[PDB]
Design an enzyme around this catalytic site. Structure first.
Site: not given
Ligand SMILES: CC#Cc1cncc(-c2cc(Cl)c([C@]3(C)CC(=O)N(C)C(=N)N3)s2)c1
Length: 386
Positions: A36, A232
């Site tokens: 991430d 991202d």
């Molecule tokens: C490709 C892909 C994917 C994918 C699939 N399932 C869950 C996630 C994620 C769940 C969560 Cl909570 C994430 C956080 C920490 C917060 C957020 O809101 N974004 C946007 C992020 N960058 N990071 S990514 C990602």
């Protein structure tokens, strides 16, 4: 150059996330961890959950150190609460090093862990500024660079299959590569073009022009970066600010006007299907995002195909997709569907991000993704939102 031990170390897909195997504790406890670039905490499941088949067992680690501090991180995606500590961490298909890193041991969560994703934690690769509870919690990558000789750079090649992968296929398939400390030249074609990292918090960049099939969206460039534009790996879609989304969708609809799609398709909610092998790729336009270059008054462009922005989903023998461009109230997000077209270099040392055509991008015999330049672009600093 060549980092064979790290090539093909990722699994997953745009809808569920791409993950890397890691080990935490002594003796090592293997976990699958979401890569991430949109967050900065290393957080792992540390208690039983219906969607987890494994979790971090702190009581079984002789090197576990309790920081005696909790952390609550609410998102619009999942919410999680954990207990902070440190432990020894390794990446089996990574650099041959073991580092002591912060770990948020997740004890409670809501809509965080997803059924069938195969990951048990998240590796936040962005900067300390956005770490929770605050910037004093050193992110994993910062610890890795401080404790070892690993260069301050990582690169990601996220590999979209171009078709749906079932539960077994997605576990057996190679989803890409995360090269820690370097650039592997086998993962891309053509040249790498670099855009400055505007500020070190998220991986923030500046978009200077947008085209749909070469037609300028012709919006004031500040609109494209309102209130920020980020790279991202933790977002599935290409997300655009509300006004940019409305202009882009109007232009994509005009370009694909020979076929009418329901409103649900454009809202990213409904799938569209075609008879096996008949997807009319040619009717959908290419999308180009021009990014600020490293040289004054210079920009370059990255061009994606509908093979990137139409996400394959299972319905039948039909080829089905969801529209993977959606609106945002928090700025542009260059998510996995964009990253699947390119090899992306997170050059933290030189405060820049590199893009090159991915050796694994999905295309057809008529068009390919592209990274081209230079272009003469004036007053690019004015595109940044304040
Ligand atoms: C490709 C892909 C994917 C994918 C699939 N399932 C869950 C996630 C994620 C769940 C969560 Cl909570 C994430 C956080 C920490 C917060 C957020 O809101 N974004 C946007 C992020 N960058 N990071 S990514 C990602």
């Amino acid at each position: 150059g060549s980092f064979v031990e790290m090539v093909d170390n990722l699994r997953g897909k745009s809808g569920q996330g791409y993950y890397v195997e890691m080990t935490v504790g002594s003796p090592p406890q293997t976990l699958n961890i979401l890569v991430d670039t949109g967050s900065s905490n290393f957080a792992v499941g540390a208690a039983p959950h219906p969607f987890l088949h494994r979790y971090y067992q702190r009581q079984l680690s002789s090197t576990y150190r309790d920081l005696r501090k909790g952390v609550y991180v609410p998102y619009t995606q999942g919410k999680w609460e954990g207990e902070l500590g440190t432990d020894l961490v390794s990446i089996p298909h990574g650099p041959n090093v073991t580092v002591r890193a912060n770990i948020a041991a997740i004890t409670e969560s809501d809509k965080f862990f997803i059924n069938g994703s195969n990951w048990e934690g998240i590796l936040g690769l962005a900067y300390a500024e956005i770490a929770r509870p605050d910037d004093s919690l050193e992110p994993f990558f910062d610890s890795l660079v401080k404790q070892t000789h690993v260069p301050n750079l990582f690169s990601l090649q996220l590999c979209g299959a171009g078709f749906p992968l079932n539960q077994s296929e997605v576990l057996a398939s190679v989803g890409g590569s995360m090269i820690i400390g370097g650039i592997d030249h086998s993962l891309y074609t053509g040249s790498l073009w670099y855009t400055p990292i505007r500020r070190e918090w998220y991986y923030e960049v500046i978009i200077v022009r947008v085209e749909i099939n070469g037609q300028d969206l012709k919006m004031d460039c500040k609109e494209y970066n309102y209130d920020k534009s980020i790279v991202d790996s933790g977002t599935t879609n290409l997300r655009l600010p509300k006004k940019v989304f409305e202009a882009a969708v109007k232009s994509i609809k005009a370009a694909s006007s020979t076929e009418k799609f329901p409103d649900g398709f454009w809202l990213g909610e409904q799938l569209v299907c075609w008879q096996a092998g008949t997807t009319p790729w040619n009717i959908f336009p290419v999308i180009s995002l021009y990014l600020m270059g490293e040289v004054t008054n210079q920009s370059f462009r990255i061009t994606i195909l509908p093979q990137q922005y139409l996400r394959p989903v299972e319905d039948s023998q039909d080829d089905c997709y969801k529209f993977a461009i959606s609106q945002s109230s928090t700025g542009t997000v260059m998510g996995a569907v964009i990253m699947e077209g390119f090899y992306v270099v997170f050059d933290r040392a030189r405060k820049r991000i590199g893009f090159a055509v991915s050796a694994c991008h999905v295309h057809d015999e008529f068009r390919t993704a592209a990274v081209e330049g230079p272009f003469v672009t004036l007053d690019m600093e004015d595109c940044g939102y304040n």
